[PDB]
């Protein structure tokens, strides 16, 4: 099995942890964070979105004992002191959101780890990979990024559409679920004034680099897509609204056929397909990073269409982080 | 003053009433609904969205007495039995949502009213008029429709963009505020399954004819626009997300210049313009039916752009209903 | 196995169904509602609160096929026409909320059923039974009621406190989750004006008979308890706030000791006990009808205390409906 | 007029500012905060709860110009450097929530101010005052506190009830609106684990010292009251739920009479009275710190009753802060 260490036991670190429990190829052996082992156990045990942890969690001697397995807990603010080698860590899931560059993440390799997977878009030229889009381009680099949740949703769909009909250009809008960075009531958000306004009372316009980032995982689409976001008061599921101009004329039925074929073929487990009258909550706990909603989309004509795809911002992304870890471990 | 009668004291009927109080040329003299005066007074007095009524409302002899003025309250299920003439009603604001056809609405004329304005889109060929779009095309018709709130937002913006740069094709998405048609919890909705899902926990994909309806008030745009909606857990303000392909190249700055010019000139009071970091709640109580958000929009290139415009589904629309009434009575 | 038939496939009927799937002794063989099989299948398959159905649901010949088992679907507005005998129904879970009287409910007996359990409080003198409170008093009655969700939470707790310290008088408040009876936006509610106000933006004071209803299942407490409710913008979990005056002095520690003893003994499975820092969502899916929150309560002195107990309005109640069914069929 | 300087332009500082615009006796001449004048102008201009500021706000030379009046803006992290004397400040409204003791608040007097009013409960023995309860006990001290919003709601009601029937003992529960200290999604809250859970999805039990604090403003009630709180997903209005044991027997009608008399007499403007079917939103913008809801309350008997009172956590409190400032200025 692959031994993983999680740096940063936040929303993502915890979902990566919970998802890993259902996997036999990956095993989390250590967790690092500036929180008390007792507090971490509580946040693992109870979750307003994902429900109670299905298993046993006890704190003994400052460490966590999850389902019997002892998990080393530390509180190092500096990655270089993590001593991952003492616990035999192969890959480190970097989830603090603070070390998104090579020289910072590299510290884990200095601390004993062999490879690092950033659970967010790298801030430098560190390569990003998205399952269904470019895992095959992986060339053995020791530090890698899993891009973002929106890019993970957009990339697979954009690939199927482009491969079959050719995307001339497209604009995306993601109706985004409330994040941890937003506020409960009108408060300060210096770099993002709109973002500081009460999340529960508002539809908040926001900018996103997720659409442009698709160009990095799918070079052939570089410069052909961009978009924005609207932050809404929902808890977990977001939706991508992609308006595209096709090179090859295609009826909506042909578009549905192409997506469905991919969902049951080369992108099974990545891209999902549905024709049901679904709503956001129906995807809470969804592992597919992109679920094509056939009935929600609409076409003006054979070359201008609006496609809709759902994604659980935490569950889908987190499972793919594990997929990348497995992939880079050969 | 134009003496108006309101049929259907629901959400729209009530806001039309509150709005009319601030107009010296329009005067509400009668209301008809299947609710007792006491309950109607209560619903006028208190509103979770618009706040308390700015004035006095009392019940005497089963009739409302608002700000000292007596208002005849009736409970006729049949418009034909309304006797509008008895109280001198000139125009009837038809807001029950039940008589959106000439046949049904004409009963008000039989009952003594001179003209009728439907506060919703016509089901038959009754002409629809949208301020800033086609009020100039009015030709003496005694029964007219004010279209829907979404159409009132899209039409003015679409006209400005088309007149200046020419819209080849467009696809819209309205992130819609929760409607009274929605369920608080997963309940039966045979007409629209998704619509019966809990409104509070979901982002609900929905269909809309507002985009296509633009082709009716702006024939030159017939067949060039269509779209859908996403209903979200917010109270009053919605936003249109318009993705358009332009005939004539235009930089985003030039597009902004054009919109601002219209807002300050020809479409003053209908189309608004802002460059502030606004969010939905900033438009609660907004009179303009469409407020261009300069900083929220984004352009892929000089011919493919995404525009954003806000609108209070109740305040804007209701003020325009009053405008149409004044317009057809000139 | 006890063969059960469900009349009314609404919220309660559906959860009773999901819950029954996990019971080897109870078996649902028929459902009756005025909805088509297709729609019912959809409502069973997807739920915004409870998630997707854990199993397979298919429609064949207008009948449901859940987990391979065929379930007879009918659409009778009249219980008398149900023919329960044809499918061998032993007990009928009456969940339409329309037949809460012996006269009306007895029609199921005429239709071939042996016994009937109302999933709501009786309107007449049909006896009500609450697990942990008076199941032992059952005396062969063929038509019984399971009371309401709030009563199921209050009764067990009230009994433990009374049996040990003696309740002289008590006043309760249930901070209630939003019900399907509520409006998403300010709409008509002649029966309860406050109840027609927008559920999403308000804290709505409401009346409840659950506290007084305790006097019926626990006669010794008749006339000693009453209370009210506050409906809030949350989905499933409610909480009772019970302020009581004790006959025998008791420290909060002694009260905790007593409650814990009952939860681990006589009331195991009905009354739960916790000392964790829980919040409402931690009880979504909770089977216990009352979960004592040890750290939330507070005592003024040894004779005046405020107790707090949580309850999932749907999961707890529905599991007990099944318990009553099994109990009256023993 | 009294010249006031505000230290801390947060939620409270801003509402105190906006309320002061409607007062001719008080004039804000300076504001201090670690935010940019441009950012402060934006937060003053737009508010999701209170709507847009009714007036003009422009930033010139690093200062704010509100309705023409120039307001000195500074960004001193240390009160002693505020130089209040240069702007002629009489009283300082201390709203940062950081200087709740004599020695810290005293710095303003060192900086040139004459008196200080803490907009929160003092952490030391600094005297607290609540309008309607003990303003008359004010003995000319230079540093004073306005207690908290819940105490401001509870104190006046408790006084009327105690004065007329005598409170033997009582327990309170405040259904509290979402505060700035809560989180949007499950995050860290080291001193309050429950408080770190998602506010939008939960009913969160919480402890409060507001009930006990009543003993400080009303010594005669010292030790007779205590309580707790439930944090719910509403934006602005909270409600006090007081269960009391009366010394003198009183029917609910006699209780309503006593409260109404006080509301129209000695506590006019402080204590409000209503018999309408109101809900939380009906009190958004309420200046009365306590509004007795006659129809929501319930009595078990003539000596044990449950009273309900509403309060806008920001508007009511803020207006009383201004009242205290006026009061201490003779
Ligand atoms: N939340 C999502 O939906 C989502 C989706 C895709 C990518 N991401 C990315 O995941 C990253 C983390 O996001 P999150 O929501 O989990 O954040 P979070 O704030 O919930 O968690 C961050 C965690 O890191 C810990 N930490 C902080 N400083 C540390 C330090 N100096 N050393 C060690 N540990 C430390 C914190 O204690 C906290 O527990 C970000 O890059 C974010 O962009 C998030
Ligand atoms: N609410 C919005 O945001 C919005 C926006 C654009 C257009 N509209 C339109 O407004 C119209 C009404 O919608 P609403 O949201 O105000 O609904 P509503 O149900 O609140 O109002 C309908 C009112 O008519 C009354 N009524 C019913 N039958 C009647 C009868 N037979 N005679 C007299 N009165 C009767 C009802 O009691 C109710 O008060 C619809 O055509 C709708 O499409 C609404
Ligand atoms: N939901 C809760 O939290 C809760 C808690 C305790 C008790 N209850 C009780 O459950 C009962 C039902 O409430 P609900 O919330 O499930 O409501 P609901 O409206 O969702 O369910 C009623 C169902 O009965 C169906 N129906 C209507 N008429 C019918 C008929 N004539 N014949 C057959 N089927 C018919 C409806 O289609 C609907 O599906 C009530 O007595 C209620 O008090 C509910
Ligand atoms: N919010 C309520 O409903 C309410 C009710 C009653 C009492 N209070 C009390 O009011 C106080 C402030 O609460 P709030 O909600 O306004 O807080 P907030 O966080 O919204 O505002 C605090 C403000 O003080 C400013 N500030 C911070 N540090 C400063 C410093 N070092 N020097 C100068 N200025 C500084 C911050 O920039 C911020 O603008 C607290 O004691 C709170 O308990 C609040």
Half-sphere exposure in the Cβ direction for A300 (13 Å, CA) = 27
| Distance separating alpha carbons of residues C78 and C75, to the nearest angstrom | 9
Question: Angle at which helices A149-165 and A252-263 pack, to 10 degrees?
Answer: 120
The verdict on B160 and B261 lying in the same domain is yes
C-beta of A178 in contact with ligand 1 (< 6 A)? no
| Distance separating alpha carbons of residues C265 and C256, to the nearest angstrom | 14
Specify whether the CB–CB gap between C129 and C218 falls below 8 A: no
Residues of chain C with Cβ-Cβ distance to B35 below 8 Å are: 188, 190
Residues of chain D with Cβ-Cβ distance to B51 below 8 Å are: 281, 284-285
The verdict on D112 and D35 lying in the same domain is yes
The verdict on A173 and A100 lying in the same domain is no
Give the residue from chain A lying closest to C48, CA to CA: A281
C-beta of A80 in contact with ligand 1 (< 6 A)? no
Tokens of A146: 């899993």
Pocket of ligand 2 (CB under 6 A): B 7-13, 32-35, 77, 95-98, 119-120, 148-149, 180, 313-314, 317; C 188
Q: Which of D15, D31, D149, D307 is catalytic?
A: D149
Specify whether the CB–CB gap between D187 and D246 falls below 8 A: no
Question: Angle at which helices D149-165 and D252-263 pack, to 10 degrees?
Answer: 120
Residues of chain D with Cβ-Cβ distance to B284 below 8 Å are: 51
The preferred substitution site among C5, C9, C10 for testing ligand 3, maximizing ligand atoms within 8 Å of CB, is C10
| Distance separating alpha carbons of residues D320 and D147, to the nearest angstrom | 10
The preferred substitution site among D9, D10, D316 for testing ligand 4, maximizing ligand atoms within 8 Å of CB, is D10
Is the Cα torsion angle A57, A60, A64, A66 positive or negative in sign? negative
DSSP assignments along B266-301, one per residue: TTTTTEEEE-S---GGGGTT--SSEEEETTT-EEEE
Which value, in Å, is the radius of gyration of the alpha carbons in chain D? 20
Specify whether the CB–CB gap between B108 and B135 falls below 8 A: no
Question: Cβ B180–C182 below 8 Å, yes or no?
Answer: no
C200 CB contacts (<8 Å, ≥6 apart)?
A: B178, B184, B199, B200, B233, B235, C178, C184, C185, C233
Tokens of A19: 């998802």
Specify whether the CB–CB gap between D4 and D87 falls below 8 A: no
A314 CB contacts (<8 Å, ≥6 apart)?
A: A11, A12, A15, A49, A50, A149, A236
The residues that bridge with A239 in the sheet, in sequence order, are A175, A310
| Distance separating alpha carbons of residues A120 and A143, to the nearest angstrom | 12
The verdict on B103 and B207 lying in the same domain is no
Is the Cα torsion angle D310, D315, D320, D323 positive or negative in sign? negative
Q: What is the CATH number of the domain that holds C270?
A: 3.30.360.10
The verdict on C101 and C120 lying in the same domain is yes
Q: Would you call B288 a catalytic residue per the annotation? A: no
Q: What is the CATH number of the domain that holds A117?
A: 3.40.50.720
The verdict on B159 and B308 lying in the same domain is yes
The verdict on D90 and D192 lying in the same domain is no
Question: Cβ C184–B180 below 8 Å, yes or no?
Answer: yes
D228 CB contacts (<8 Å, ≥6 apart)?
A: C296, C297, C298, C306, C308, D172, D173, D174, D205, D206, D207, D208
Experimental technique used to determine this entry? X-ray
The residues that bridge with D231 in the sheet, in sequence order, are D176, D204
For residue A79, give the nearest of A55, A102, A59 by alpha carbon. Answer: A102
D164 CB contacts (<8 Å, ≥6 apart)?
A: D248, D250, D258
C-beta of D78 in contact with ligand 4 (< 6 A)? no
- Runs of H (alpha helix) within D69-117: 102-105, 107-110
Q: Residue with the nearest Cα to atom 9 of ligand 2? A: B120
Burial of C108 (0-12, 13-18, 19+ CB in 10 A): buried
3-state secondary structure of C308: strand
The verdict on A87 and A205 lying in the same domain is no
The verdict on C153 and C184 lying in the same domain is yes
Specify whether the CB–CB gap between A311 and A149 falls below 8 A: yes
The verdict on D250 and D286 lying in the same domain is yes
The verdict on D61 and D140 lying in the same domain is yes
Specify whether the CB–CB gap between A187 and D12 falls below 8 A: no
Question: Cβ D204–C280 below 8 Å, yes or no?
Answer: yes
| Distance separating alpha carbons of residues C173 and C165, to the nearest angstrom | 21
Q: How many folded domains does chain C comprise?
A: 2
Q: How many whole angstroms from C23 Cα to the centroid of ligand 3? A: 22
> Which residue, among D41, D52, D54, would best test binding to B if mutated, counting the most B CBs under 10 Å from its CB?
D52
**Chain position carrying tokens 């302020």:** C243
| Distance separating alpha carbons of residues C34 and A88, to the nearest angstrom | 62
3-state secondary structure of A152: helix
Give the residue from chain C lying closest to B42, CA to CA: C193
Residues of chain A with Cβ-Cβ distance to B301 below 8 Å are: 169
The verdict on D237 and D110 lying in the same domain is no
For residue C308, give the nearest of C261, C255, C262, C265 by alpha carbon. Answer: C255
Question: Angle at which helices C149-165 and C315-328 pack, to 10 degrees?
Answer: 80
3-state secondary structure of D189: coil
Question: Cα angle at D254 between D248 and D256, to 5 degrees?
Answer: 120
Q: Of all residues in chain C, what percent are helix, strand and coil, respectively (each to 5)?
A: 30, 30, 40
- Runs of H (alpha helix) within chain D: 11-20, 37-45, 102-105, 107-110, 149-165, 210-217, 252-263, 315-328
Question: Cβ B304–A241 below 8 Å, yes or no?
Answer: no
B132 CB contacts (<8 Å, ≥6 apart)?
A: B155, B156, B159, B266, B267, B270, B271, B289, B290
Question: Cβ C186–B39 below 8 Å, yes or no?
Answer: no
Instruction: Note down the domain range covering C19.
Output: 1-147+314-330
């Amino acid at each position: 099995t692959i031994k993983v260490g999680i740096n940063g036991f936040g929303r993502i670190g915890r979902i990566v942890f919970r998802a890993a429990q259902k996997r036999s190829d990956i095993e989390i052996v250590a967790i690092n964070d500036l929180l008390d082992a007792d507090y971490m156990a509580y946040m693992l045990k109870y979750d307003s979105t994902h429900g109670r942890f299905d298993g046993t969690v006890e704190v003994k001697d400052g460490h966590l004992i999850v389902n019997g397995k002892k998990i080393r807990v530390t509180a190092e603010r500096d990655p270089a002191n993590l001593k991952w080698d003492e616990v035999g860590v192969d890959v480190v899931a970097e989830a603090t959101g603070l070390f998104l560059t090579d020289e910072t993440a590299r510290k884990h390799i200095t601390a004993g780890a062999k490879k690092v997977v950033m659970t967010g878009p790298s801030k430098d030229n560190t390569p990003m990979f998205v399952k269904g889009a470019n895992f095959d381009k992986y060339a053995g680099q020791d530090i890698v990024s899993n891009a973002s949740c929106t890019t993970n949703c957009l990339a697979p769909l954009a690939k199927v559409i482009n491969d079959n009909f050719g995307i001339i250009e497209g604009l995306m809008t993601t109706v985004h679920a409330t994040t941890a960075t937003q506020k409960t009531v009108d408060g300060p958000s210096h770099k993002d004034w709109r973002g500081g306004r009460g999340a529960s009372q508002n539809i908040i316009p926001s900018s996103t680099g997720a659409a442009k980032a698709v160009g990095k995982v799918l070079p052939e689409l570089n410069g052909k897509l961009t978009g924005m976001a609207f932050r809404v008061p929902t808890p977990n599921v977001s939706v991508v609204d992609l308006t595209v101009r096709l090179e090859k004329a295609a009826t909506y039925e042909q578009i549905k056929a192409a997506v469905k074929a991919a969902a049951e073929g080369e992108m099974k487990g990545v891209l999902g397909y549905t024709e049901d009258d679904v709503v956001s909550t129906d995807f809470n706990g969804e592992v597919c990073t992109s679920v094509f909603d056939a009935k929600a989309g609409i076409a003006l004509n054979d070359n201008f269409v609006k496609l809709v795809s759902w994604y659980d911002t935490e569950t889908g992304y987190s499972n793919k982080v594990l997929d990348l870890i497995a992939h880079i471990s050969k």
